[PDB]
RNA sequence: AAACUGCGGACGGCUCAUUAUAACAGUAAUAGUUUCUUUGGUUACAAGGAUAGCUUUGUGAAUGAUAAAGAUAAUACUUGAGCAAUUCAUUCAAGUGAGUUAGGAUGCCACGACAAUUGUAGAGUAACCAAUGAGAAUUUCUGAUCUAUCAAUCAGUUGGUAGUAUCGAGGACUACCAAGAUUAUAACGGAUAACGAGGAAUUGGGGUUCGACAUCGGAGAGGGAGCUUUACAGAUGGCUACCACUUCUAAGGAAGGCAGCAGGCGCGUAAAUUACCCACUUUCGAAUUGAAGAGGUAGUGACGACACAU
RNA sequence: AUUACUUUGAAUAAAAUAAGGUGUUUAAAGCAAAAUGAAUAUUCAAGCAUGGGACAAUGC
């Protein structure tokens, strides 16, 4: 559709073809406020219940300390990492913990 | 000094003072950066008849 | 209160409108006063901008006119006979414009040609 | 008798008739209420015409008429002059009262002079 | 907006009022009168900016209410009286008189009026209508309603008005040989001679105006304020003589 | 002409009655059928008390099934800045048709003029019309 | 001082819940309506009662609570004397692109005045014609995000006649007649973390995203609904009824609506003093003077922007 | 014969963007000062008028 009067299809084609964008569709579907525990919120506040050790993937070899946190808004259970070494001693239960993502976007 | 104009209807004169270091009302007295030279805006109402009524 | 806006109507496509604001005074409405046959009784309404409207409730005398002889004298209204809008107005004897009424030409079929609900009086001519 | 308030100082209405103070939209039209705004009809619990137990407490132009004070006498002595330690007659309102050469000079009888309708 | 507004915001005022953007929150809304909202300059602006007599609005009230300023033949005592077109101004206390004329720089200018020449003020007729009782009359550009004028006086002419007597002296027709001062948009502030008129029945009548030096511009008919006949001016023109300089000697001269 | 409940009469009726007719403005001739005809219409631009104000458009008559009112289809092109291309569009306007235009039919170019609101939708009046082809459906006003 | 009377609180300030051709932006119309204020012009030597403020008796815990009595005034309310505009029926007829048009005349019907007005010294009133005012309000043309796991939608609905109501056109409402109106050029329906615009962030060009928020327009005052005053309110720092809250309490009862300015609880990743002054800008008022948590000043403040120490 | 296209205008709120000038000492700023207010350029998409008819659509 290259014609001078053929602007109806080119707008229709671009509208339909934009939904295949894996990232553009993600920010427009109604799931950030539903499926994402954080949502548009930058950080999250919750409570610590259970502490985990997640063994590293196949190329590596170790146990990564982790905790299980239930938020104060959604109430779901999520797993959080320890940013430093020996920080599992400092962490406790039923205390305010801030959770904000990782290097990769969500 | 500077500019001297006389109000023909308000019975006063508007002047611009400049410091080089009861009938006069002094406002706008501020100095330059770091002090020293100071300026202002002196108003003189001569006769008290106009001063007592042309004043906030 | 009665309103005369189109916000409550439907589009030409049948699409029901959606309410954005509540009722406003600029589109007021008032109930009709069906001027019947009875003792002279007129209520003056306070319209917008302070103007006054004469709302006639019951009248008996109208200042009918004759065009073929150029005479305008009052005559007593007998009864409402024919109405172009509703035959049920005849039974109630509502006085509205265009209502064919009969009179006795003591000072001389008449059609009312005024707005008793607005002007406050009945006038007509000779058919 | 006359009117009166209620046990809680609620006026008994000569119009309505109730044994316990009822509430109705009210203004100075029947005296029971003092409108704060313009047309402030308030539903206030005022007593009715019944005198039952709840009622508990049951209770010069015009100066040209103080006593036949006509005008033409120009009387400033007939007008009351109670004295204070000043001799104080209140006033004489719109009339032909003595001065009356501001009234009829141009404000009432120029009038085809201060009312000229001309060509 | 339940009714008419009483406050005028600073930034919503007409741009030709010289008002600053950080001067204040509100601008003085002119009261209703002979001239329009955007066709008038408030009296407070004249005595605070164009004349610099009053430092602020505190002293503006102590001048107008003192019966010191006379607008046209009569005298006004309103702080925000709508002062529009060249209707005269008289301040006998300071022995100075002015006139509210336009200029090419899109503003209101105060030309100096002598005492003798302040007795008259030309007015442009806006419409001619015949009232009840066969009493025809005209309405001018300041809304002034006068009694029986010349029967030849039409709706879009100009008349020579008097102040003390309030009578008519001379009237100039709207023709192909007159001089006009513009009161509208692009051309407003210009003086020129009407050379051609083109009439479109549907929407507007368009005229052509040629300046004294030969510059030609075009404008709408509502904007044509006739100032004289046969290249003659009946009033004192502003400092720049109402001529339009095409920016060629505006930036260059202002450097020196 | 006279077949309804009320007595249908012209808005401006005067004894000679005469056939009232006023002159419309910017260069529109008065139709012949508006003079010798016996019809009575209270909203006709010529023989009634409705004017023709500023806006004036044109279109193709598509519907001729409503009494003294027709629908004109105006087709234009909408320009889209991003794609630098136009697109076909249309709008339907309800215009009151006076009984003067006896030969008016669907598919004929018609010039319409604005006026005060005559109905909930009808606010334009037919001024003149031009004949066109045929499609075996001679649907008139 | 008071109090009666007049004017104002329909301006201003706040918030963005509703809202998908709705509103809004440009544009044209109002020969389809129009006030308030302001401006120009026109049209008996003075009648009468009662009412507050005023004096006296109280109630109850009371609200900006409350009744009787005795009085006392108007530029408060009426009477009273020297054409304008309104309806109908007929007719004569000149600007405007456009009018049985402004306007005049004929005959009854209705309202029918220019305060029975005011300072010794510095104007006001009653209607009407026209400006105001590009104003307000209705309305014309064009223009808006996604969606077909939305393809057919509407019955006052589309058109006509007559009336009704309105300030006014109009299915805005009622009575009678016809079946019509929209739709693949996306009608109808659904979603919004949708108030719209001037604009902002970023861009070689093209574009993408944001816009509650300085200014303009729209809407609302916890939720609808109905009304009073008047020139403008369907007002809510007005009232009335219900729904949901909240306060004092003498237990009988009373009013209140911080999406105004400070401040509190909760919500949260998320956001400041329970300060002073109308002296700057402007508004209202009986008007040079009174008021303004508008506005200005003062305090916190690493949201940011500019200059600059070791 | 319209329309589209194209060229000129008319009129079009400010603030904001680009800026014309101006030693807030520079700069951010402000329209101030030592009479000037930028002509300030607009304004996507529509609407009015006009010069042209090559490329285009509408039926004769």
Question: What attributes characterize this protein structure?
Answer:
part of a larger assembly; 6 chains; A: 106 residues; alpha+beta; four-stranded antiparallel β-sheet; 2 helices; 4 strands; C: 127 residues; mainly beta; three-stranded mixed β-sheet; 29% strand; RNA-binding; rRNA-binding (chain E); ribosomal protein (chain E); RNA-binding (chain E); ribonucleoprotein (chain E)
Polypeptide structure, described:
The PDB classes it as ribosome. Keywords: 75S Ribosome, A/P-tRNA, P/E-tRNA, Entamoeba histolytica, Ribosome. Cryo- EM structure of 75S ribosome with A/P- & P/E- tRNAs from Entamoeba histolytica. The structure is cut from a larger assembly and holds chains A (106 residues), B (56 residues), C (127 residues), D (119 residues), E (256 residues) and F (141 residues). With 106 residues, chain A is an alpha+beta fold. Helices cover 14% and strands 27% of the residues of chain A. The longest helix of chain A is centred in the N-terminal third of the chain and has 10 residues, at 8-17. In chain E, the strands form 5 sheets. In chain E, strands 16-15-14-13-17 form a 5-stranded antiparallel β-sheet, with no helix packed on it. A 4-stranded antiparallel β-sheet of chain E has the order 4-6-7-8, with no helix packed on it. By secondary structure, chain E is mainly beta. Chains in contact: A-F, B-E, C-F, E-F. The A-F interface holds A 3-8, 10-11 and F 77, 80, 83, 85-88. Chain E binds 2 RNA strands through β1, β2, α2, β9 and β10.
**Regarding quaternary structure, how should these chains be classified?**
part of a larger assembly
**Helix fraction of chain C?**
under 10%
Structural class of chain D: little secondary structure
Biggest interface, chains and residues, is: A-F, 8 and 7 residues
Rg of chain D: 25 Å
With helices defined by DSSP (H or I, 4 residues minimum), what is the helix count of chain D? 1
N-end to C-end Cα span of chain D: 66 Å
PDB class: ribosome
Keywords: A/P-tRNA, P/E-tRNA, Entamoeba histolytica, Ribosome
Entry title: Cryo- EM structure of 75S ribosome with A/P- & P/E- tRNAs from Entamoeba histolytica
Chain A: 40S ribosomal protein S23, putative
In short:
Chain B is mainly β.
Layout of SSEs?
This is part of a larger assembly, with chains A (106 residues), B (56 residues), C (127 residues), D (119 residues), E (256 residues) and F (141 residues).
Chain B: E1 4-7, E2 12-15, E3 17-19, E4 24-31, E5 38-44, H1 48-51
Antiparallel strand pairs in B: 1-2, 2-5, 3-5, 4-5
Chain C: E1 36-37, E2 41-46, E3 52-59, E4 61-62, E5 65-66, E6 71-72, E7 75-76, E8 79-82, H1 88-92, E9 100-102, E10 110-112, E11 124-126
Parallel strand pairs in C: 1-3
Antiparallel strand pairs in C: 2-3, 4-7, 5-6, 8-9, 9-10, 10-11
Chain E: E1 8-9, E2 26-27, E3 41-42, H1 43-50, H2 57-64, E4 70-71, E5 82-83, E6 88-91, E7 96-103, E8 107-112, E9 120-131, E10 135-140, E11 158-162, E12 168-172, E13 178-182, E14 191-199, E15 205-210, E16 216-220, E17 224-229, H3 251-255
Antiparallel strand pairs in E: 1-2, 3-5, 4-6, 6-7, 7-8, 9-10, 9-11, 11-12, 13-14, 13-17, 14-15, 15-16
Chain E binds two RNA strands through β1, β2, α2, β9 and β10.
């Amino acid at each position: 559709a290259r014609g001078l009067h053929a602007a109806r299809k080119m707008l229709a084609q671009r509208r339909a073809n934009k939904w295949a964008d894996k990232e553009w569709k993600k920010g427009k579907l109604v799931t950030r406020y539903k499926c994402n525990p954080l949502g548009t919120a930058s950080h999250a506040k919750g409570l610590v219940q259970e502490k985990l050790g997640i063994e590293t993937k196949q190329p590596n070899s170790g146990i990564r300390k982790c905790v299980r946190v239930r938020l104060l808004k959604n109430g779901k259970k999520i797993t959080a990492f320890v940013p430093r070494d020996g920080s599992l001693n400092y962490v406790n239960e039923n205390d305010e913990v801030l959770i904000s993502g990782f290097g990769r976007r969500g | 000094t500077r500019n001297l104009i006389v109000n023909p209807l308000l019975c006063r004169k508007q002047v611009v003072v400049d410091i080089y270091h009861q009938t006069i009302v002094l406002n706008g007295f501020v100095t330059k950066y770091g002090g020293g030279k100071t300026s202002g805006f002196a108003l003189i109402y001569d006769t008290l008849s106009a001063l007592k009524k042309f004043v906030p | 209160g009665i309103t005369r806006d189109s916000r409550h109507k439907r589009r030409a496509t049948g699409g029901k409108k959606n309410s954005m604001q509540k009722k406003k005074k600029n589109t007021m409405g008032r109930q009709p006063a069906n001027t019947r046959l009875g003792a002279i009784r007129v209520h003056d309404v306070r319209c917008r901008y302070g103007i006054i409207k004469r709302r006639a409730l019951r009248l008996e005398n109208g200042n009918f006119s004759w065009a073929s002889q150029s005479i305008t004298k009052g005559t007593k209204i007998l009864n409402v006979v024919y109405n172009a809008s509703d035959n049920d107005f005849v039974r109630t004897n509502t006085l509205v414009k265009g209502a064919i009424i009969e009179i006795d030409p003591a000072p001389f079929l008449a059609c009312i040609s005024s707005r008793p609900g607005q002007t406050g009086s009945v006038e007509g001519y000779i058919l | 008798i006359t009117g009166g308030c209620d046990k809680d100082g609620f006026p008994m209405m000569t119009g309505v008739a109730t044994n316990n103070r009822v509430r109705l939209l009210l203004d100075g039209r029947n005296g029971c209420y003092k409108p704060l705004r313009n047309g402030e009809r308030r539903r206030k619990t005022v007593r009715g015409a019944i005198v039952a137990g709840d009622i508990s407490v049951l209770n010069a132009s015009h100066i040209r008429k103080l006593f036949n004070l006509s005008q033409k006498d120009d009387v400033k002595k007939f007008v009351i002059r109670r004295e204070v330690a000043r001799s104080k007659a209140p006033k004489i309102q719109r009339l032909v009262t003595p001065r009356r050469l501001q009234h009829k000079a141009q404000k009432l009888e120029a009038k085809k002079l201060h009312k000229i309708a001309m060509l | 907006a339940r009714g008419p507004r009483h406050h005028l915001k600073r930034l919503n005022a007409p741009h030709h009022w010289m008002l600053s953007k950080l001067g204040g929150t509100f601008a003085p809304k002119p009261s209703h009168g002979p001239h329009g909202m955007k066709e008038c300059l408030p009296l407070i602006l004249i005595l605070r900016n164009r004349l610099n007599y009053a430092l602020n609005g505190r002293e503006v009230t102590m001048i107008v209410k003192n019966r010191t300023i006379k607008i046209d033949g009569k005298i006004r005592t309103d702080t925000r009286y709508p002062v529009g077109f060249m209707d005269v101004l008289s301040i006998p206390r300071t022995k100075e008189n002015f006139r509210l004329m336009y200029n090419t720089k899109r503003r209101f200018c105060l030309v100096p009026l002598t005492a003798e020449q302040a007795k008259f003020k030309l007015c442009k007729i806006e419409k001619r209508v015949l009232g009840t009782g066969a009493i025809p009359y005209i309405v001018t550009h300041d809304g002034r309603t006068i009694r029986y004028p010349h029967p030849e006086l039409q709706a879009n002419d100009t008349i020579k008005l008097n102040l003390e007597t309030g009578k008519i002296v001379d009237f100039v027709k709207f023709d192909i040989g007159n001089t006009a001062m513009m009161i509208g948009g692009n051309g407003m502030g210009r003086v020129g001679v009407i050379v051609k008129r083109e009439v479109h029945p549907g929407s507007f009548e368009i005229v052509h105006i040629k300046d004294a030096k030969g510059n030609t511009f075009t404008t709408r008919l509502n904007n044509v304020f006739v100032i004289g006949k046969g290249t003659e001016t009946l009033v004192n023109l502003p400092l720049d003589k109402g001529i339009k300089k095409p920016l060629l000697q505006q930036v260059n001269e202002t450097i020196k | 002409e006279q077949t309804e409940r009320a007595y249908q009469k012209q808005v401006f009726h005067h004894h000679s009655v005469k056939r009232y007719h006023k002159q419309i403005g910017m260069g529109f001739v008065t139709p012949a059928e508006a003079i010798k005809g016996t019809y009575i219409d209270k909203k006709c631009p010529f023989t009634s008390d409705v004017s023709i104000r500023g806006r004036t458009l044109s279109g193709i008559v598509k519907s001729c099934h409503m009494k003294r009112t027709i629908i004109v289809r105006r087709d234009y092109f909408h320009y889209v800045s991003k794609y630098q291309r136009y697109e076909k569009r249309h709008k339907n306007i309800a215009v009151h048709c006076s009984p003067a235009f006896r030969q008016l039919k669907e598919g004929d170019h018609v010039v319409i003029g604005q006026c005060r609101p005559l109905s909930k939708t009808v606010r334009f009046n037919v001024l003149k019309f031009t004949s066109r082809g045929t499609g075996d459906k001679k649907q008139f006003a």
